[PDB]
Amino acid sequence: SGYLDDVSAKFDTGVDNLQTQVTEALDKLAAKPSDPALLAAYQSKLSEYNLYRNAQSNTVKVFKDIDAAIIQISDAEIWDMVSQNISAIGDSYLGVYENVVAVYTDFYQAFSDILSKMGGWLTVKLDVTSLKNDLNSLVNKYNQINSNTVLFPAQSGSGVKVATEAEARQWLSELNLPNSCLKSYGSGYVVTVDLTPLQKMVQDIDGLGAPGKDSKLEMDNAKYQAWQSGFKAQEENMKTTLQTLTQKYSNANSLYDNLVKVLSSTISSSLE
């Protein structure tokens, strides 16, 4: 509709550039495989590329609203009007990250609850059975597909919402989660919490050996320290996953704010 074609066509150039940048970022990383900086740069670019492809596949719905509102102009007002007419984007980008962090925070919080009754389970004697049982119930509970376990899509109220394999895999790589987090359900797929640290924990408790009639098992300090160390390490792993996803979210808010600035500029300029 008039300038809209100008915003979109100029916008497509953006997707091409990011696409090129992603590859370029990836090659720099290929030269130094374990370089943290280059990895972070590449994934921010990947996320950003996905964001623009998001916007692109929503131009109709979005240009509709924005245009309808341009028809009832300041620049801080262009920005404002753009800000409140791109929910199709923010909800499938930021809203997704919002859900990802809330769900993972509750998942972790549930683990914390189990950790909170360790004293009541402690040479030294550990309640192998009681501990392993609480862990296994956590594994099974979060190994299912419901509102407490799904990171993407966001589960809106009642009923399970799925996505295509491609969409789920896209989020799987952006969230940097492992294959075990991708599950099939009905017509499509979903991305859930990573249970690997928890499963390693029980796998470690079993390595401790068969418990006594106590259903508990006494062990000499040597192997106790080694066990609790291995256990605390798995906990830090979950805690690290929660932090990295929180950091991805904060980065996405920034990338999103820059997409809105660009969108606003192209529109404001398409007038002049």
End-to-end Cα distance, the chain: 16
Chain position carrying tokens 């990250």: 97
List the helix and strand counts (H, then E) for the chain.
Answer: 9, 5
Q: What is the identity of the amino acid at 219? A: M
Q: Parallel, antiparallel, or unpaired: how do β-strands 217-219 and 124-126 relate?
A: antiparallel
Contact 205, 224 (CB under 8 A): no
Residue listed under structure tokens 């090129």? 20
How many Å separate Cα 182 from the centre of its chain? 12
Method: X-ray
> Count of alpha carbons within 13 Å of 146, Cβ hemisphere only?
8
Q: Tokens in use for 67?
A: 């245009």
Residue 249 to residue 34: CA distance in whole angstroms: 22
Q: Which two tokens stand for residue 80?
A: 């404002």
Q: Which residue in the block uniquely carries the two structure tokens 């998001």?
A: 54
Name the DSSP letter for residue 146: S
Containing 80, the helix (H) or strand (E) segment is helix 75-83
CATH of span 1-272: 1.20.1710.10
Q: How far does Cα 81 stand from its chain's mean position?
A: 29
Residue 201 dihedral angles phi and psi, to the nearest 5°: -60, -55
What are the Cα distances from residue 153, in Å, to 22, 44, 45, 78, 144? 24, 21, 22, 31, 15
Other beta carbons within 10 angstroms of residue 212's beta carbon come to 11
Cα(146)–Cα(154) distance, integer angstroms: 10
Range list of β-strands (E), the chain: 124-126, 150-152, 182-185, 188-192, 217-219
Tell me which DSSP letter residue 176 carries.
T
Are 38 and 242 a contacting pair, CB within 8 Å?
Answer: no
Reported resolution, Å = 2.4
Tell me the C-alpha distance between 81 and 260, whole Å: 10
Phi, psi angle pair for 116, to nearest 5°: -65, -10
Checking DSSP bridges between strand 217-219 and strand 150-152, what pairing results, if any? unpaired
* β pairing state of 150-152 and 124-126: unpaired
Q: How far out from the chain centre does Cα 141 lie?
A: 20
